[PDB]
Design a protein around this nucleic acid. Structure first.
Length: 294
RNA sequence: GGGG
């Protein structure tokens, strides 16, 4: 796959807070600094590949991040959070990186999810392809160790929503879907000031043939659950594990599950209507009836 | 900086 103005204030001398590179500073809000670092620090890593400059963020007034009620007091939303961006690199680096950021501020970095479903014989219900990605141990305090997810990752710099959903679908399942068969189904943005770095998420759906070859993760494959012990996990007290043993393929790390099961499994850590809120097809797709979410 |  094919992998208004920002006022930078040059620091004549670097503060010992970080100790012949140049150092530039940008004072802005989390509404904008969210996009220069991106969904998973990935847009920052890409600004690093393209220009070589390193980026670091820090709240300007972290003390306001501890108050509950509202220059002083609690922040109302995560977008009013004051953020200080520091750029480290050559002068041509900060220069080249400066416009890339000025094009990134106008984009909308998001996480993307492609709900892949298949029809069943003797059926009006459908099954969805499910993954279990094991999260890094350097993760915020509200993110569990293992995430039961549908295929999808995040957009790259300059990448549109649906192409990212198509790209990252193949990266985690080896399945190739055509753009004419992907339909947008919704978007969520639920963040709180303390999680000022959270980006929204765009949702899509598509139907694959019932006999489709599910190869599994094609990128970072050891970052997903596979080759588990069938009996060991069958006695786990977590209902998701007990569901993973019964349904998932240990060779690929993928499982086909009904929407009545997904919402039940996701109910503790998400709530009700998990599938219907995210993956309800639009009427023009002739898919609402076959999906069964209405 | 993981939309479970």
């Amino acid at each position: 796959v094919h992998l208004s103005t920002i006022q930078l204030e040059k620091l004549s001398h670097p503060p010992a807070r970080f100790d012949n590179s140049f150092v530039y500073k940008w004072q802005t809000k989390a509404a904008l600094a969210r996009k220069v670092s991106g969904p998973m620090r990935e847009w920052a890593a890409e600004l690093k590949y393209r220009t070589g400059v390193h980026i670091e963020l820090e709240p300007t007034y972290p003390e306001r991040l501890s108050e509950n009620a509202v220059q002083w007091g609690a922040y109302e939303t995560a977008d009013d959070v004051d953020i200080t961006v520091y750029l480290f690199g050559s002068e041509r680096g900060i220069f080249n990186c400066h416009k890339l950021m000025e094009a990134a501020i106008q984009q909308d970095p998001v996480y993307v999810r492609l709900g892949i479903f298949r029809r069943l014989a003797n059926s009006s219900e459908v099954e969805w392809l499910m993954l279990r990605r094991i999260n890094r141990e350097l993760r915020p305090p509200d993110i569990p160790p293992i995430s039961l997810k549908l295929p999808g990752k995040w957009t790259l710099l300059y990448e549109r929503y649906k192409e990212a959903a198509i790209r990252t679908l193949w990266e985690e399942t080896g399945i190739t879907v055509d753009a004419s068969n992907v339909y947008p189904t919704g978007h969520l943005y639920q963040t709180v000031p303390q999680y000022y770095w959270r980006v929204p998420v765009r949702y899509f759906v598509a139907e694959v043939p019932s006999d489709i070859r599910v190869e599994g993760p094609q990128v970072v494959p050891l970052q997903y659950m596979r080759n588990w012990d069938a009996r060991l996990l069958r006695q786990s007290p977590d209902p998701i594990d007990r569901a993973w043993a019964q349904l998932a393929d240990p060779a690929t790390g993928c499982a086909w599950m009904k929407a009545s099961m997904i919402d039940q499994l996701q109910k503790p850590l998400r709530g009700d209507n998990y599938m219907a809120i995210r993956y309800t097809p639009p009427p023009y797709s002739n898919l609402q009836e076959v999906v069964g979410l209405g």
